[PDB]
Amino acid sequence: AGTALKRLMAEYKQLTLNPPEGIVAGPMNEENFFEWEALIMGPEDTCFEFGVFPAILSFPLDYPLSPPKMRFTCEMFHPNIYPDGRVCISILHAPAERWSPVQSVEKILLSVVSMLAEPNDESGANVDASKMWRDDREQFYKIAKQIVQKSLGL
Amino acid sequence: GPSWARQESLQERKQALYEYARRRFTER
């Protein structure tokens, strides 16, 4: 085991022992701790409430020196998620608060939950979603509920 | 416990989150 592997094993154990609300995360298979799936639930009383959004987190060899990449494998409609599902957030950019020794998988996932709860507007990875959030919030909320339904298969 | 039980537990927790969310999304 190298430094990345020991750290990922430790973070997985901690996430399992202390699960964040509405987040199920870990390696997809323990024979490769560099590829994780995280299921993130849209928080209750927010526009994506009860959506279940799967994301792949792909970790670099030198973790935790460098951040993972993260992409959703469900449809999304969000200012900070590219149309192809890639997540565009400051915590995942190499040195707002960017990747550093303080950061962790738990903080990545919590930051994504927060951005769902409160969509923000610096990045424009989805300009249509950025514009609808800014100017037609009621219509944004209608599409969010559709994204939720789709995430549940309903 | 072992790897395989952690993996089955993880997959069970994923299934359980979907079941939980579908109930909440369709309730009232």
Side-chain angles (χ1 to χ4, degrees):
Chain A
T3 299
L5 178 62
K6 291 168 187 171
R7 165 74 179 246
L8 287 162
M9 292 177 36
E11 292 199 56
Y12 179 39
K13 189 176 164 295
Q14 253 304 302
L15 275 172
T16 300
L17 198 76
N18 297 286
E21 250 307 307
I23 292 171
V24 181
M28 287 192 284
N29 194 283
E30 288 189 17
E31 81 212 325
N32 178 8
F33 261 86
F34 292 86
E35 299 297 329
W36 289 33
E37 181 178 59
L39 293 191
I40 298 152
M41 192 185 73
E44 183 166 359
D45 296 317
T46 70
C47 59
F48 295 102
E49 64 174 7
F50 313 119
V52 174
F53 310 120
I56 296 299
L57 283 81
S58 296
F59 291 85
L61 189 67
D62 65 339
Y63 188 78
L65 284 188
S66 301
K69 294 178 326 191
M70 183 177 181
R71 57 195 177 87
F72 281 101
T73 55
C74 57
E75 187 171 352
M76 295 294 258
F77 187 75
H78 190 282
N80 308 316
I81 308 178
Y82 284 96
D84 71 359
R86 285 173 296 130
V87 171
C88 182
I89 58 178
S90 51
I91 190 153
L92 298 176
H93 299 149
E97 56 151 20
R98 326 234 296 176
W99 187 257
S100 83
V102 163
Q103 308 294 28
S104 68
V105 176
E106 187 174 340
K107 291 179 178 153
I108 294 172
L109 299 177
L110 290 174
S111 301
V112 173
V113 170
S114 168
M115 104 183 183
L116 297 181
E118 311 167 325
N120 249 247
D121 246 85
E122 290 304 324
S123 128
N126 188 331
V127 297
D128 300 328
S130 310
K131 291 188 174 296
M132 193 178 298
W133 179 258
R134 185 178 65 203
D135 292 335
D136 199 349
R137 193 74 59 89
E138 194 178 9
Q139 171 99 149
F140 187 95
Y141 295 154
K142 211 151 206 311
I143 294 170
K145 201 180 170 183
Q146 296 287 312
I147 286 298
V148 169
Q149 273 170 31
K150 290 171 187 186
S151 78
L152 302 177
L154 299 173
Chain B
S3 163
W4 41 101
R6 284 190 296 273
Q7 294 180 164
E8 298 306 277
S9 171
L10 189 61
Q11 186 60 47
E12 287 170 5
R13 285 168 60 217
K14 293 182 187 172
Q15 287 162 359
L17 181 60
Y18 276 100
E19 291 171 321
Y20 173 79
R22 288 196 183 104
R23 190 180 62 77
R24 297 306 310 281
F25 183 73
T26 59
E27 79 179 356
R28 256 280 197 186

Short mmCIF file of all heavy atoms in Angstrom, two decimals, chain A residues 108-145:
data_model
loop_
_atom_site.label_atom_id
_atom_site.label_comp_id
_atom_site.label_asym_id
_atom_site.label_seq_id
_atom_site.Cartn_x
_atom_site.Cartn_y
_atom_site.Cartn_z
N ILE A 108 -15.57 17.16 -0.17
CA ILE A 108 -16.02 17.25 -1.56
C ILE A 108 -17.52 17.01 -1.62
O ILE A 108 -18.28 17.76 -2.25
CB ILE A 108 -15.30 16.22 -2.45
CG1 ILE A 108 -13.80 16.55 -2.55
CG2 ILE A 108 -15.94 16.20 -3.87
CD1 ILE A 108 -12.96 15.50 -3.25
N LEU A 109 -17.96 15.93 -0.98
CA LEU A 109 -19.35 15.51 -1.13
C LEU A 109 -20.27 16.51 -0.46
O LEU A 109 -21.32 16.87 -1.01
CB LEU A 109 -19.55 14.11 -0.56
CG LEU A 109 -18.70 13.05 -1.27
CD1 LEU A 109 -18.87 11.69 -0.63
CD2 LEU A 109 -19.01 12.98 -2.76
N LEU A 110 -19.87 17.00 0.70
CA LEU A 110 -20.66 18.03 1.36
C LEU A 110 -20.71 19.30 0.53
O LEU A 110 -21.72 20.01 0.54
CB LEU A 110 -20.08 18.32 2.73
CG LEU A 110 -20.26 17.19 3.75
CD1 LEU A 110 -19.50 17.58 5.03
CD2 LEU A 110 -21.76 16.88 4.04
N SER A 111 -19.63 19.63 -0.19
CA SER A 111 -19.68 20.83 -1.01
C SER A 111 -20.64 20.68 -2.16
O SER A 111 -21.27 21.66 -2.57
CB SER A 111 -18.29 21.19 -1.52
OG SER A 111 -17.44 21.38 -0.42
N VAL A 112 -20.73 19.47 -2.71
CA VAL A 112 -21.66 19.21 -3.80
C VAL A 112 -23.09 19.25 -3.29
O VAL A 112 -23.98 19.79 -3.95
CB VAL A 112 -21.30 17.87 -4.46
CG1 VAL A 112 -22.36 17.47 -5.49
CG2 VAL A 112 -19.92 18.00 -5.12
N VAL A 113 -23.33 18.71 -2.09
CA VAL A 113 -24.67 18.79 -1.51
C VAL A 113 -25.07 20.23 -1.33
O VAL A 113 -26.21 20.62 -1.61
CB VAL A 113 -24.72 18.03 -0.17
CG1 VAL A 113 -26.03 18.33 0.55
CG2 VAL A 113 -24.60 16.55 -0.46
N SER A 114 -24.14 21.05 -0.84
CA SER A 114 -24.41 22.46 -0.63
C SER A 114 -24.74 23.16 -1.95
O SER A 114 -25.66 23.99 -2.01
CB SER A 114 -23.20 23.12 0.04
OG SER A 114 -23.31 24.52 0.01
N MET A 115 -24.00 22.85 -3.01
CA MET A 115 -24.23 23.51 -4.28
C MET A 115 -25.58 23.10 -4.88
O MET A 115 -26.20 23.91 -5.58
CB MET A 115 -23.07 23.19 -5.23
CG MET A 115 -23.40 22.18 -6.28
SD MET A 115 -21.97 21.77 -7.33
CE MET A 115 -22.77 20.66 -8.43
N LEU A 116 -26.03 21.87 -4.64
CA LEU A 116 -27.39 21.49 -4.98
C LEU A 116 -28.41 22.31 -4.20
O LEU A 116 -29.32 22.91 -4.77
CB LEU A 116 -27.61 20.00 -4.69
CG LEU A 116 -26.77 19.01 -5.47
CD1 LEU A 116 -27.16 17.62 -5.04
CD2 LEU A 116 -26.99 19.19 -6.95
N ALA A 117 -28.28 22.31 -2.87
CA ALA A 117 -29.15 23.09 -2.00
C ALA A 117 -29.23 24.55 -2.44
O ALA A 117 -30.32 25.12 -2.56
CB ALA A 117 -28.65 23.00 -0.55
N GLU A 118 -28.07 25.16 -2.67
CA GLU A 118 -28.02 26.56 -3.09
C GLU A 118 -27.14 26.74 -4.33
O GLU A 118 -25.99 27.16 -4.22
CB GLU A 118 -27.48 27.43 -1.96
CG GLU A 118 -28.16 27.19 -0.62
CD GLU A 118 -27.42 27.83 0.54
OE1 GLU A 118 -26.17 27.87 0.49
OE2 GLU A 118 -28.08 28.29 1.49
N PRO A 119 -27.75 26.60 -5.50
CA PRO A 119 -27.02 26.73 -6.74
C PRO A 119 -26.33 28.05 -6.77
O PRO A 119 -26.97 28.96 -6.47
CB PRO A 119 -28.10 26.61 -7.79
CG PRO A 119 -29.20 25.85 -7.14
CD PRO A 119 -29.13 26.15 -5.69
N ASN A 120 -25.07 28.15 -7.14
CA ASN A 120 -24.38 29.45 -7.07
C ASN A 120 -23.96 30.01 -8.44
O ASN A 120 -24.23 29.37 -9.45
CB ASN A 120 -23.24 29.37 -6.05
CG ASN A 120 -23.51 30.22 -4.78
OD1 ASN A 120 -22.82 31.20 -4.52
ND2 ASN A 120 -24.48 29.81 -3.96
N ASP A 121 -23.31 31.19 -8.53
CA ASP A 121 -23.06 31.69 -9.89
C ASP A 121 -21.77 32.39 -10.26
O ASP A 121 -21.74 33.55 -10.66
CB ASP A 121 -24.25 32.53 -10.40
CG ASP A 121 -24.96 31.90 -11.57
OD1 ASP A 121 -25.83 31.07 -11.34
OD2 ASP A 121 -24.70 32.28 -12.71
N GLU A 122 -20.71 31.65 -10.10
CA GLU A 122 -19.42 32.06 -10.55
C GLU A 122 -19.12 31.28 -11.82
O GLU A 122 -18.87 31.85 -12.88
CB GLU A 122 -18.40 31.82 -9.47
CG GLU A 122 -18.61 32.77 -8.34
CD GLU A 122 -18.57 34.18 -8.86
OE1 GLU A 122 -17.76 34.41 -9.79
OE2 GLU A 122 -19.35 35.03 -8.37
N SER A 123 -19.15 29.96 -11.72
CA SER A 123 -18.92 29.11 -12.85
C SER A 123 -20.18 29.07 -13.68
O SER A 123 -21.25 29.28 -13.16
CB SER A 123 -18.57 27.70 -12.34
OG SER A 123 -19.37 26.65 -12.91
N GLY A 124 -20.00 28.78 -14.94
CA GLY A 124 -21.06 28.65 -15.88
C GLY A 124 -20.77 27.40 -16.65
O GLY A 124 -20.56 27.44 -17.80
N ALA A 125 -20.72 26.27 -15.97
CA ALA A 125 -20.53 25.03 -16.71
C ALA A 125 -21.78 24.66 -17.47
O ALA A 125 -21.69 24.02 -18.53
CB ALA A 125 -20.09 23.91 -15.76
N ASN A 126 -22.95 25.07 -16.99
CA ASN A 126 -24.19 24.93 -17.74
C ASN A 126 -24.80 26.32 -17.82
O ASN A 126 -25.44 26.79 -16.87
CB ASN A 126 -25.13 23.93 -17.09
CG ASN A 126 -26.33 23.64 -17.93
OD1 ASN A 126 -26.77 24.49 -18.70
ND2 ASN A 126 -26.88 22.43 -17.80
N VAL A 127 -24.60 26.99 -18.96
CA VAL A 127 -25.02 28.38 -19.04
C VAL A 127 -26.54 28.47 -19.05
O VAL A 127 -27.12 29.41 -18.50
CB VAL A 127 -24.39 29.08 -20.26
CG1 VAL A 127 -22.89 29.10 -20.10
CG2 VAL A 127 -24.80 28.41 -21.55
N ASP A 128 -27.22 27.51 -19.67
CA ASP A 128 -28.67 27.51 -19.64
C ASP A 128 -29.16 27.43 -18.21
O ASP A 128 -30.07 28.16 -17.81
CB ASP A 128 -29.23 26.36 -20.48
CG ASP A 128 -28.80 26.45 -21.94
OD1 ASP A 128 -28.63 27.58 -22.43
OD2 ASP A 128 -28.63 25.40 -22.59
N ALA A 129 -28.58 26.53 -17.40
CA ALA A 129 -29.01 26.45 -16.02
C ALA A 129 -28.63 27.70 -15.24
O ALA A 129 -29.39 28.18 -14.39
CB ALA A 129 -28.43 25.20 -15.35
N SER A 130 -27.46 28.28 -15.54
CA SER A 130 -27.06 29.50 -14.85
C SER A 130 -28.08 30.60 -15.11
O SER A 130 -28.55 31.27 -14.18
CB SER A 130 -25.69 29.97 -15.32
OG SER A 130 -24.73 28.92 -15.28
N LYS A 131 -28.46 30.77 -16.37
CA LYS A 131 -29.39 31.82 -16.76
C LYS A 131 -30.78 31.58 -16.19
O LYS A 131 -31.42 32.53 -15.73
CB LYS A 131 -29.43 31.93 -18.28
CG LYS A 131 -28.13 32.48 -18.83
CD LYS A 131 -28.19 32.78 -20.32
CE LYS A 131 -26.90 33.48 -20.80
NZ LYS A 131 -26.67 34.84 -20.19
N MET A 132 -31.26 30.34 -16.21
CA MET A 132 -32.59 30.08 -15.66
C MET A 132 -32.60 30.26 -14.14
O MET A 132 -33.59 30.72 -13.58
CB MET A 132 -33.07 28.69 -16.03
CG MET A 132 -34.55 28.49 -15.76
SD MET A 132 -35.10 26.88 -16.24
CE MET A 132 -34.75 26.92 -18.00
N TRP A 133 -31.51 29.90 -13.47
CA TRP A 133 -31.44 30.10 -12.03
C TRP A 133 -31.52 31.59 -11.72
O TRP A 133 -32.25 32.03 -10.81
CB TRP A 133 -30.13 29.51 -11.48
CG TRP A 133 -30.00 29.72 -10.01
CD1 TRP A 133 -29.24 30.65 -9.36
CD2 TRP A 133 -30.69 28.99 -8.99
NE1 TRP A 133 -29.41 30.55 -8.01
CE2 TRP A 133 -30.30 29.53 -7.75
CE3 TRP A 133 -31.59 27.92 -9.00
CZ2 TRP A 133 -30.76 29.04 -6.56
CZ3 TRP A 133 -32.05 27.44 -7.82
CH2 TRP A 133 -31.65 28.00 -6.60
N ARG A 134 -30.80 32.38 -12.49
CA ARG A 134 -30.72 33.81 -12.27
C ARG A 134 -32.06 34.47 -12.53
O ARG A 134 -32.56 35.24 -11.70
CB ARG A 134 -29.64 34.39 -13.18
CG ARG A 134 -29.32 35.86 -13.01
CD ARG A 134 -28.19 36.21 -13.98
NE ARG A 134 -28.64 36.06 -15.37
CZ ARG A 134 -27.86 35.86 -16.43
NH1 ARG A 134 -26.53 35.77 -16.33
NH2 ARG A 134 -28.43 35.75 -17.63
N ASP A 135 -32.70 34.14 -13.66
CA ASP A 135 -33.78 34.96 -14.18
C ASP A 135 -35.14 34.31 -14.19
O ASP A 135 -36.13 35.02 -14.33
CB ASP A 135 -33.46 35.42 -15.61
CG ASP A 135 -32.31 36.40 -15.66
OD1 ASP A 135 -32.06 37.10 -14.66
OD2 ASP A 135 -31.67 36.49 -16.71
N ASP A 136 -35.24 32.98 -14.06
CA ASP A 136 -36.53 32.31 -14.13
C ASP A 136 -36.52 31.14 -13.15
O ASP A 136 -36.65 29.97 -13.50
CB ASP A 136 -36.82 31.89 -15.56
CG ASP A 136 -38.28 31.61 -15.80
OD1 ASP A 136 -39.05 31.52 -14.80
OD2 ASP A 136 -38.64 31.45 -16.98
N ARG A 137 -36.37 31.51 -11.87
CA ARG A 137 -36.23 30.54 -10.79
C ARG A 137 -37.41 29.58 -10.72
O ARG A 137 -37.23 28.38 -10.45
CB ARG A 137 -36.07 31.31 -9.48
CG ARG A 137 -35.61 30.49 -8.32
CD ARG A 137 -34.16 30.14 -8.44
NE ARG A 137 -33.28 31.31 -8.51
CZ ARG A 137 -32.76 31.93 -7.46
NH1 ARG A 137 -33.02 31.52 -6.22
NH2 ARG A 137 -31.96 32.98 -7.64
N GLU A 138 -38.64 30.07 -10.92
CA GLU A 138 -39.81 29.18 -10.87
C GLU A 138 -39.70 28.10 -11.95
O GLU A 138 -40.05 26.94 -11.72
CB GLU A 138 -41.11 29.99 -11.03
CG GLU A 138 -42.41 29.23 -10.67
CD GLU A 138 -43.71 30.06 -10.79
OE1 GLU A 138 -43.68 31.19 -11.33
OE2 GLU A 138 -44.78 29.55 -10.34
N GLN A 139 -39.21 28.47 -13.13
CA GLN A 139 -39.00 27.49 -14.18
C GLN A 139 -37.80 26.59 -13.86
O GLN A 139 -37.80 25.39 -14.21
CB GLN A 139 -38.79 28.20 -15.52
CG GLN A 139 -38.34 27.32 -16.68
CD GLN A 139 -39.46 26.92 -17.60
OE1 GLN A 139 -39.26 26.73 -18.80
NE2 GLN A 139 -40.67 26.79 -17.04
N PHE A 140 -36.78 27.12 -13.19
CA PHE A 140 -35.69 26.25 -12.74
C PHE A 140 -36.21 25.16 -11.82
O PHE A 140 -35.86 23.98 -11.96
CB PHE A 140 -34.60 27.06 -12.02
CG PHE A 140 -33.36 26.23 -11.69
CD1 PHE A 140 -32.28 26.23 -12.53
CD2 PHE A 140 -33.31 25.45 -10.55
CE1 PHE A 140 -31.15 25.47 -12.24
CE2 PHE A 140 -32.19 24.68 -10.26
CZ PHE A 140 -31.13 24.69 -11.10
N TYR A 141 -37.07 25.54 -10.87
CA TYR A 141 -37.58 24.58 -9.90
C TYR A 141 -38.39 23.49 -10.58
O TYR A 141 -38.38 22.34 -10.15
CB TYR A 141 -38.45 25.30 -8.86
CG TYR A 141 -37.72 26.28 -7.97
CD1 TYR A 141 -38.40 27.36 -7.40
CD2 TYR A 141 -36.38 26.14 -7.68
CE1 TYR A 141 -37.76 28.25 -6.58
CE2 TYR A 141 -35.72 27.02 -6.87
CZ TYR A 141 -36.41 28.08 -6.31
OH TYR A 141 -35.74 28.96 -5.51
N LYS A 142 -39.11 23.84 -11.65
CA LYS A 142 -39.86 22.82 -12.39
C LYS A 142 -38.93 21.82 -13.06
O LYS A 142 -39.23 20.62 -13.09
CB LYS A 142 -40.76 23.48 -13.44
CG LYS A 142 -42.03 22.73 -13.73
CD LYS A 142 -43.14 23.69 -14.16
CE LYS A 142 -44.51 23.11 -13.86
NZ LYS A 142 -44.68 21.69 -14.35
N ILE A 143 -37.81 22.28 -13.61
CA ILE A 143 -36.87 21.36 -14.25
C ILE A 143 -36.14 20.52 -13.19
O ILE A 143 -35.89 19.33 -13.39
CB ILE A 143 -35.90 22.12 -15.16
CG1 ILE A 143 -36.67 22.74 -16.33
CG2 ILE A 143 -34.81 21.19 -15.71
CD1 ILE A 143 -35.83 23.70 -17.14
N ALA A 144 -35.81 21.14 -12.05
CA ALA A 144 -35.19 20.40 -10.96
C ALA A 144 -36.04 19.22 -10.54
O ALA A 144 -35.53 18.11 -10.33
CB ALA A 144 -34.99 21.32 -9.78
N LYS A 145 -37.36 19.43 -10.40
CA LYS A 145 -38.21 18.32 -10.01
C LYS A 145 -38.20 17.23 -11.07
O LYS A 145 -38.27 16.03 -10.74
CB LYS A 145 -39.63 18.81 -9.71
CG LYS A 145 -40.41 17.84 -8.82
CD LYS A 145 -41.86 18.28 -8.50
CE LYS A 145 -42.66 17.13 -7.82
NZ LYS A 145 -44.10 17.44 -7.53
#
